[PDB]
Amino acid sequence: DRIDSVSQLQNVAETTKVLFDVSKETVELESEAFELKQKVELAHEAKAVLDS
Amino acid sequence: QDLYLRELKDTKLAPSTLQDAEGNVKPWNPPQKPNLPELELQGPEALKAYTEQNVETAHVAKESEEGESEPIEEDWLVLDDAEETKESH
């Protein structure tokens, strides 16, 4: 039973490699989204003000 | 047509000083030159937030914070905390 349990560490590291990489990668790639948020807000304000 | 021409120039001259000529406004006493061009020009700004939205204040995006360059304490603490929970899987 211990053998069967340890059989599952055989390839966990290979997948969790890309998992841990892309986790932080995607979490920090929202910087461009944050920079786009202010531009989108400015555009929304401009459209609203000219609608006014 | 007398029924036509006289009403036509009457409907032309009454707003003539109003719109065509710069004779303020004769049909009603209150002035219109300093009211809609001038007082009501800020009307959209009066109803809205004046000097706050019409200027479209642009706030520079705050710099996104991170682990604040902690390559020792954070990693060791994470490893120790995972070790605490690994004994009770």
Swiss-Prot record, chain A:
Record PTM Phosphoserine, positions in chain: 5
A GO molecular function annotation here is: proton transmembrane transporter activity
GO terms under biological process: protein-containing complex assembly; proton motive force-driven ATP synthesis
Record's GO cellular component terms: mitochondrial inner membrane; mitochondrion; proton-transporting ATP synthase complex
**What subcellular locations does the record give?**
Mitochondrion; Mitochondrion inner membrane
Is the Nucleus keyword given for this protein? no
* UniProt KW keywords: CF(0), Hydrogen ion transport, Ion transport, Membrane, Mitochondrion, Mitochondrion inner membrane, Phosphoprotein, Transit peptide, Transport
Q: Does the keyword Nucleotide-binding apply?
A: no
Q: What is its main location?
A: mitochondrion
Quaternary structure, per UniProt, is: F-type ATPases have 2 components, CF(1) - the catalytic core - and CF(0) - the membrane proton channel. In yeast, the dimeric form of ATP synthase consists of 17 polypeptides: alpha, beta, gamma, delta, epsilon, 4 (B), 5 (OSCP), 6 (A), 8, 9 (C), d, E (Tim11), f, g, h, i/j and k.
- Misc. comment: Present with 12900 molecules/cell in log phase SD medium.
Task: Tell me, in a sentence or two, what this protein's role is.
Answer: Mitochondrial membrane ATP synthase (F(1)F(0) ATP synthase or Complex V) produces ATP from ADP in the presence of a proton gradient across the membrane which is generated by electron transport complexes of the respiratory chain. F-type ATPases consist of two structural domains, F(1) - containing the extramembraneous catalytic core, and F(0) - containing the membrane proton channel, linked together by a central stalk and a peripheral stalk. During catalysis, ATP synthesis in the catalytic domain of F(1) is coupled via a rotary mechanism of the central stalk subunits to proton translocation.
Homology family: Belongs to the eukaryotic ATPase B chain family.
Name listed for the protein in its UniProt record: ATP synthase subunit 4, mitochondrial
Provenance organism: Saccharomyces cerevisiae (strain ATCC 204508 / S288c)
What are the top taxonomic ranks of the organism? Eukaryota, Fungi, Dikarya, Ascomycota, Saccharomycotina
UniProtKB/Swiss-Prot annotation, chain B:
Q: What the protein does?
A: Mitochondrial membrane ATP synthase (F(1)F(0) ATP synthase or Complex V) produces ATP from ADP in the presence of a proton gradient across the membrane which is generated by electron transport complexes of the respiratory chain. F-type ATPases consist of two structural domains, F(1) - containing the extramembraneous catalytic core and F(0) - containing the membrane proton channel, linked together by a central stalk and a peripheral stalk. During catalysis, ATP synthesis in the catalytic domain of F(1) is coupled via a rotary mechanism of the central stalk subunits to proton translocation.
Q: What is its main location?
A: mitochondrion
Similarity comment: Belongs to the ATPase h subunit family.
Q: Which UniProt keywords apply?
A: ATP synthesis, CF(0), Hydrogen ion transport, Ion transport, Membrane, Mitochondrion, Mitochondrion inner membrane, Transit peptide, Transport
Q: Which GO terms describe its biological process?
A: cristae formation; mitochondrial proton-transporting ATP synthase complex assembly; proton motive force-driven ATP synthesis; proton transmembrane transport
Q: Where is this region: Disordered?
A: 54-89
Keyword field contains Transferase:
no
Source organism per entry reads Saccharomyces cerevisiae (strain ATCC 204508 / S288c) (Baker's yeast)
Name of the molecule in the record: ATP synthase subunit H, mitochondrial
Listed under subunit, the entry gives: F-type ATPases have 2 components, CF(1) - the catalytic core - and CF(0) - the membrane proton channel. In yeast, the dimeric form of ATP synthase consists of 17 polypeptides: alpha, beta, gamma, delta, epsilon, 4 (B), 5 (OSCP), 6 (A), 8, 9 (C), d, E (Tim11), f, g, h, i/j and k.
Q: What else is known?
A: Present with 6140 molecules/cell in log phase SD medium.
